[PDB]
Amino acid sequence: GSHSMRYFFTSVSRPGRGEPRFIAVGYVDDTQFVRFDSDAASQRMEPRAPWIEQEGPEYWDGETRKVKAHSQTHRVDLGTLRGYYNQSEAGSHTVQRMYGCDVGSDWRFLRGYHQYAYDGKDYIALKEDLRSWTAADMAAQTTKHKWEAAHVAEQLRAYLEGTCVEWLRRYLENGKETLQRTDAPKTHMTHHAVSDHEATLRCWALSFYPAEITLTWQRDGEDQTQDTELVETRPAGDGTFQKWAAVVVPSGQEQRYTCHVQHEGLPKPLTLRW
Amino acid sequence: IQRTPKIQVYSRHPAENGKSNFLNCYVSGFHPSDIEVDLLKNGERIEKVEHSDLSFSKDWSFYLLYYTEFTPTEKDEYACRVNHVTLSQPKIVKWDRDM
Amino acid sequence: RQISQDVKL
């Protein structure tokens, strides 16, 4: 199937409580592989998956150099945005950035991303064509005009279509045993009643990878959304994921309902009944 | 933009009394990132709790996994206690081994 | 692998 590489960056200013704190994390699909914490012991980019340890000192030096430079730029950006939005130096603020690339089943380029947020809302984003920008508000047009002049998109395009794709491929090959695995979900259904009148059926999906999954309820072979509850896919803590979907049914009608599970690790979709 | 955390409390593996496991509290969908998260045993704060590195979703909202190793019993009651700027008082979610 | 340039708002 398809794959992605993504980096996620967060900086928070806290006036009167020191200089900003910066956190960087890198993922391939749903697996974290690197981290940097500006207040942590090492002051280096750190490994978080076994296969990235295959990379040598030039890599760890280079990635450390780049992430530290990124942290300093966010410190500059926090000041820049305070100015753009005419804000005082008393409040706490947050800058976020994400970038990365998607490839299809043939490992060829599908899509690239490069975008920023300020205080929980969009600020600026690279469009799908990798040639133009979407500015979220009037303030962000200043950044847009600046980046168009300095040809930022062209440089970013080269990374997203080349370097990003090639290194995603390298990681997938180097960590084949884990990154290219598909762990099908362990599935079961439970039944619970507090009254004589209704019962909750809960369809479970456990120990699956990647996180991508679809859980649907049907009644008499028709999709059923009313009286259902679906929880957010959640991490087990061991590199696998969990999810449940539940439906409240009238007593005596449990057998009308089926739970349908779709996952890459399943050769065909699964059907569960009470 | 501020967003209130979603909270899920659950075990890593299917719970079996007397067998070691990990207790998880997954907080997600929040903004800003400043958050307080305690795991509780019979109403008391568990000392040794670890957490994931701050990350975020496509809507920019943050998520963290807090976790501790524990051995569940019939007697003991577990919970997650969360405070955030969006909450007037700490929010307590009890661990239900079936959720 | 990270992008190899300095992007500033």
Side-chain angles (χ1 to χ4, degrees), chain A residues 79-129:
Chain A
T80 303
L81 292 159
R82 212 144 59 223
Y84 290 176
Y85 291 106
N86 303 135
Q87 294 165 332
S88 81
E89 328 145 7
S92 172
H93 301 273
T94 307
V95 173
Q96 288 161 277
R97 179 192 187 185
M98 182 276 298
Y99 68 73
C101 54
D102 296 347
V103 302
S105 292
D106 60 353
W107 295 8
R108 285 174 185 174
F109 181 82
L110 275 182
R111 194 166 172 182
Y113 310 86
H114 182 273
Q115 52 201 50
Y116 283 81
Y118 186 55
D119 287 341
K121 68 254 166 59
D122 289 329
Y123 181 72
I124 198 172
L126 187 60
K127 302 167 102 87
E128 196 171 355
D129 76 353

Side-chain angles (χ1 to χ4, degrees), chain B residues 37-54:
Chain B
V37 182
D38 287 321
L39 300 175
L40 304 172
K41 183 188 185 175
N42 302 308
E44 296 174 348
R45 183 190 177 274
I46 301 173
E47 297 230 62
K48 183 176 180 182
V49 174
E50 299 174 82
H51 61 259
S52 61
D53 294 329
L54 191 66

Side-chain angles (χ1 to χ4, degrees), chain A residues 110-156:
Chain A
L110 275 182
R111 194 166 172 182
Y113 310 86
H114 182 273
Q115 52 201 50
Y116 283 81
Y118 186 55
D119 287 341
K121 68 254 166 59
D122 289 329
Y123 181 72
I124 198 172
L126 187 60
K127 302 167 102 87
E128 196 171 355
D129 76 353
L130 311 185
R131 289 170 174 81
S132 51
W133 301 96
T134 301
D137 61 9
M138 179 53 76
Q141 283 179 46
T142 301
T143 306
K144 183 169 175 278
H145 298 323
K146 188 162 81 187
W147 286 355
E148 285 168 339
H151 302 276
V152 177
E154 292 58 49
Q155 305 169 28
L156 270 48

Side-chain angles (χ1 to χ4, degrees), chain A residues 9-29:
Chain A
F9 306 90
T10 309
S11 297
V12 178
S13 64
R14 293 174 305 188
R17 296 205 285 166
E19 292 307 313
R21 176 170 167 70
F22 172 87
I23 305 295
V25 293
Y27 284 80
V28 175
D29 305 327

Side-chain angles (χ1 to χ4, degrees), chain A residues 66 73 77 146 159 171, chain C residues 1-2 5-9:
Chain A
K66 293 184 283 185
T73 295
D77 293 341
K146 188 162 81 187
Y159 165 85
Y171 297 156
Chain C
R1 174 172 185 136
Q2 287 168 103
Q5 44 188 74
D6 221 328
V7 172
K8 227 150 221 152
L9 297 184

Side-chain angles (χ1 to χ4, degrees), chain A residues 49-60:
Chain A
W51 50 265
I52 204 67
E53 296 173 64
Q54 288 177 35
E55 306 297 331
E58 294 81 13
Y59 178 90
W60 296 105

Side-chain angles (χ1 to χ4, degrees), chain A residues 8-10 12 17 23 25 27 32 35 48 94 96-98 115-117 119-122 192 202 204 206 229 231-238 242 244, chain B residues 1-3 6 8-14 22 24 26 28-29 31-34 51-63 65 97-99:
Chain A
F8 302 97
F9 306 90
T10 309
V12 178
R17 296 205 285 166
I23 305 295
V25 293
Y27 284 80
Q32 191 183 339
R35 61 99 73 162
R48 283 291 182 274
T94 307
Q96 288 161 277
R97 179 192 187 185
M98 182 276 298
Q115 52 201 50
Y116 283 81
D119 287 341
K121 68 254 166 59
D122 289 329
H192 274 128
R202 187 169 285 114
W204 285 88
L206 297 174
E229 180 181 12
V231 294
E232 181 187 351
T233 300
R234 66 200 193 186
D238 61 2
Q242 303 178 352
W244 61 256
Chain B
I1 301 301
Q2 301 185 333
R3 299 185 182 273
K6 300 165 284 173
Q8 293 196 68
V9 59
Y10 55 103
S11 55
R12 178 179 297 181
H13 302 291
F22 277 88
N24 291 330
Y26 183 58
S28 63
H31 223 290
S33 62
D34 211 322
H51 61 259
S52 61
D53 294 329
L54 191 66
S55 196
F56 56 82
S57 303
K58 88 110 81 185
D59 69 358
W60 309 107
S61 66
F62 296 101
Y63 61 84
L65 180 66
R97 59 181 75 197
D98 300 292
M99 294 195 91

